């Protein structure tokens, strides 16, 4: 029912998900001058060495690669996290044009896309219990800009033709998530929400300072995807991003001076 068009887009979501006007909603603009360097933060430790990708799926608002999370195979720990968070999926948000597409903004600058890597707190047992917890989820957000091609993205790009419309999935084994990470792991962090319905306020956002670059041909193939399912009017999947929400009583902390 909810979507990203004029009639079902982010400005209507509060009618079905009243938490959309809550206190810790996401995304936000990261004012880099008002973020506080916090030395009490630990380095991010990404242990994706034994990650097990399963499928890629068009869910009708994005495409999503899923992982086997029944074991500590790909985990995130450190940073502002307490405990161990298992990788569950990643997905992308992107625009119709290269000057918009990201959900988070940095000094009001929008990037061409955003990669979201979704992890959940193992102490809660499964992901459906974690999403009801104030600290149940950790999302690692990575900006994409348009420049040179990114090799570790090309395997995703090559299969997009197989999942063009909503509900299609394809096998997607032996994918390495480390190929999507920038060279530096400097980050901002703040407590937030999911950026799509149901917009649960369960996320510790970790947003990386350094973007990854992708080529225009690579992003062009993202925009060839469809919101609709097969046998329907053709709606290209673009501008699947929520606009920035007020920070309200929240401080953004930085891991880097
Ligand atoms: N962009 S995000 O903050 O990293 C993010 C991370 C994990 C998520 O699960 C979502 N949200 C969904 O996956 N919503 C599907 C759904 C829609 C309506 N009813 C039930 C389920 C957003
Ligand atoms: Zn997302």
Residue numbers in the entry: 4 to 125, 127 to 261
Quote the study on this structure.
CAs dysregulation is linked to many diseases, including cancers expressing CA IX. With CA isoforms sharing similar structural features, designing CAIs to specifically target a single isoform has proved challenging. X-ray crystallography was used to determine the structures of both CA II and CA IX-mimic in the complex with three inhibitor compounds (3g, 3h, and 3j).
Of note, the pyridine containing derivatives 3g and 3h, which reported sub-nanomolar KI values of 0.30 and 0.24 nM, respectively, were thus the most potent CA IX inhibitors among the compounds reported. Compound 3g contains a 2-ureidobenzenesulfonamide and 3h contains a 1-ureido-benzenesulfonamide, relative to the heterocyclic pyridyl functional group. The conformational freedom afforded by F131V in CA IX-mimic abates the energetic penalty of this polar–hydrophobic interaction and allows for the pyridine to maximize the much-preferred hydrophobic interactions between the carbon chain of the linker. Compound 3j’s affinity profile and binding conformation illustrate the imperative nature of targeting the selective pocket while 3g and 3h illustrate the profound impact on binding affinity that can be conferred by designing drugs that effectively leverage this site. All solved structures had a resolution range between 1.1 Å (CA IX-mimic and 3j) and 2.0 Å (CA IX-mimic and 3g) and were resolved to space group P 1 21 1. Mean I/σ ranged from 7.6 (CA IX-mimic and 3g) to 18.6 (CA II and 3j) and average temperature factors ranged from 18.3 Å2 (CA IX-mimic and 3h) to 27.4 Å2 (CA IX-mimic and 3g).
